[PDB]
Structures are given as C-alpha cells and as structure tokens.
C-alpha cells in the first residue's frame, strides 16, 4: 500500500472539527509509530507510540519548536499490538487534538502552537503498514 515515511497536506492548515484517519498494520517486531503535524519546521503535535522504552509500552506526545523539543507528555495505556491492523482517529478540537485508537478514546493534547491554519501537514513514519491516510469534516 503507501509509502512511509508519508506525507499527508492538510490544505489550508487543521481546523476544529476536521477529522484525520490513518488506517495501517503494525509491523512485526515494531520499536515505533510516529505522526507529526507539522507547522513548517516545527512540530505542533508529535504522536509518539513505543514499544520498548525500558521494556515498557508507552506513547510519547510532545511539540518541537525552533528544533527544540518541550515537555513531553505521556499516556501508558497502549492499545497498539505488533502485527495487528490498527485505526487512529484524530479529531481537532478548538483547544485540543483528541485522539481515539480502532474507536476507543486515548488522549487528548492542548494545543501548544495556536496559529492552527499553520499546521498544514502531517507526517506518518515508523513500523507500520501504512493502509489509508484521509480526512474529512465533521
Ligand atoms: C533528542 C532526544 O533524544 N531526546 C530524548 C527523548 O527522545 C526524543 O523524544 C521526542 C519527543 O519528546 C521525540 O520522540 C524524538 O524522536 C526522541 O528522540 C526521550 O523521550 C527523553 C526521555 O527519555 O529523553 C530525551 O533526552
């Protein structure tokens, strides 16, 4: 299917309301998934599943600015499997990124970059087989 690294344009930027879905396969044997919405160089959300991290599971968020990244935030509920098709939704929200995993809700982000019309891309990478990238409104 698609090639990852994959570059998703999101025109115009994200707006509340707008819905993304990625719809892959975690690889056998996967170190990590990653989604990057990205404002120009800096990252405004950085989705972060890992699978061995001190042979811990745990998803790292966070927001790179001026190629620094900030405080991370992390959610130890992991609802990805090695080898298993997975769904991420990602809902934008007026204060936040909320995220769900094959329709079970996750986490949320606040918003750290503000200028939302700004994040115009996103950027999928890591262990998986990627099936469909979309999005739609909501
Ligand atoms: C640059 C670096 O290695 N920082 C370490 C963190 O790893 C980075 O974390 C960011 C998100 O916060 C990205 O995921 C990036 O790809 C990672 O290299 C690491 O999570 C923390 C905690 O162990 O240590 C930093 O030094």
């Known amino acids: 299917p698609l090639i990852v690294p994959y570059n998703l ?10 819905l993304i879905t990625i719809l892959g396969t975690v ?12 404002r120009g160089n800096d990252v405004a959300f950085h989705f972060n599943p890992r699978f061995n991290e001190n042979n811990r599971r ?3 968020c966070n927001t790179k600015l001026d190629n620094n990244w900030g405080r991370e935030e992390r959610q130890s509920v992991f609802p ?3 080898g298993k098709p997975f769904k991420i939704q990602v809902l934008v929200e ?10 079970a809700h996750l986490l949320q982000y606040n918003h750290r970059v503000k200028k939302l019309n700004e994040i115009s891309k996103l950027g999928i990478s890591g262990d998986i087989d990627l099936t469909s ?3 739609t409104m909501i």
């Open 27 to 38: 690889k056998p044997n996967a170190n990590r998934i990653a989604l990057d919405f990205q």
């Open 9 to 18: 344009p999101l025109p115009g930027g994200v707006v509340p309301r707008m």
């Open 58 to 60: 745990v998803i790292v």
């Open 94 to 103: 007026p204060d936040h990124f909320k995220v769900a995993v094959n329709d």
């Open 133 to 135: 990238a979309s999005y």
């Open 80 to 82: 990805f499997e090695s």
